[PDB]
Design a protein around this ligand. Structure first.
Ligand SMILES: [Mg+2]
Lengths: 171, 171, 171
């Protein structure tokens, strides 16, 4: 069965990220190691971080954007993590492959929808998760805030209050 | 059930690829972001591109070749993509792991045979695909042209004619 | 069913590894392509190598350590390989996702426990392997030597004697 799981990835520019390694405008040769903050779909709790690498594939002169090939993980503190591989395109939504998971996400497979909001500041993901041993914990599956350019994490989540973080949230 | 899927990866050297990032002869430290053209097994249609990264592991003085560790995706336009992780060896055939997929390839698992033809210009892959929700579309499963150093994509595919490309082929 | 598989990864510093690519103390931007030796859990045989990339995510001033995001494979000679994606933390144990496999490991999924021993010299992994077509070969599933800072591969394995290597062990 498909378990849907949405999360917000938010870049506050306090994590040295994205650290552009310029070897190539974005072109092949450009490497972008990155790590952003990760929040629940309902924006109430900090869950952890994203962490991995974007490989610039090319600039697209046409759509004033770039195409990346991405390999990264989404960390949910004590819950574990999900891993993905796929396209990140600055100019449209994309689906990435779910390569696997750990913790509650052990056995994870399927695909994930990546949704553009602010560039490169806010992203909204919806994981179409199969293969989990159990139903997702309730604190991770609150009704997601519908994505827009203005939606924001709860103050307690930004501030890192016990009420706005999951157990041993990834920092 | 195993669905077999063969594709030709072709480098025309018009995509800035391979963009060698020399930090190490090929040795550890060398990083090779790459992207090539991707065609159907029967060579009739352009499907998309490959895109990802080869990490040089070592030079092999013995077999006048090199060993790479590769993380990349195969893009099939509107159909989605397949992702892989594994060995690329300039001197023999290898099998890579299928890490996942998106679109029609959602749930993909198994292994893929990589076959050397021209170096590093033409490769022939055979995906032993399990986990797909449906049978592969007929335009992707035409009887493959048996691999050799001379086999070539149809003129319409090189030229990008409607008859020689899949829907929204990855470019 | 879960098949448990333990292996020792050992760095002898004869493989040019880890080849630190300094772009950032370890911080984001730092890239660490690596390849180490790989032995059976019972330390009797050389099976192959590890090979892939660690992406520094950040230094942790608190725990005098660093957090990495890792994408790599474990090579077992003629048997094939396993691929993973996940966290490598110099200061605690971690679980990585099993993204797939090839050979006898085709269809592999699950998670792997990474255990710290010497830094960065000896690691002990325990793969909780699901999805394999057959039971693991007996030479790979000998009772593992319980991990400590002093445990070592058998002399024949270091020396590469026929009795201390698997068939076509990855070198
Ligand atoms: Mg997988």
């Amino acid at each position: 069965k498909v378990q849907e799981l949405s999360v917000y990835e938010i870049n506050d520019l306090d994590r040295h990220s994205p650290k552009i390694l310029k070897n190539a405008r974005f072109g092949l040769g450009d490497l972008v190691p990155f790590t952003n903050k990760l929040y629940t779909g309902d924006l109430k709790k900090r869950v952890g971080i994203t962490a991995g690498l974007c490989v610039v594939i090319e600039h697209v002169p046409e759509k004033n954007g770039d195409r990346f090939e991405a390999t990264y993980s989404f960390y949910f503190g004590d819950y574990g993590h999900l891993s993905v591989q796929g396209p990140y395109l600055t100019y449209e939504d994309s689906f990435l492959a779910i390569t696997g998971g750990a913790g509650i996400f052990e056995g994870a497979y399927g695909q994930v929808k990546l949704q553009q909001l602010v560039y490169p500041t806010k992203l909204f993901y919806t994981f179409y998760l199969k293969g989990l041993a159990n139903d997702l914990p309730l604190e991770l599956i609150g009704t997601p805030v519908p994505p827009s350019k203005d939606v924001e994490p709860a103050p307690e989540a930004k501030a890192l209050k016990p009420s706005g973080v999951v157990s041993n949230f990834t920092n």
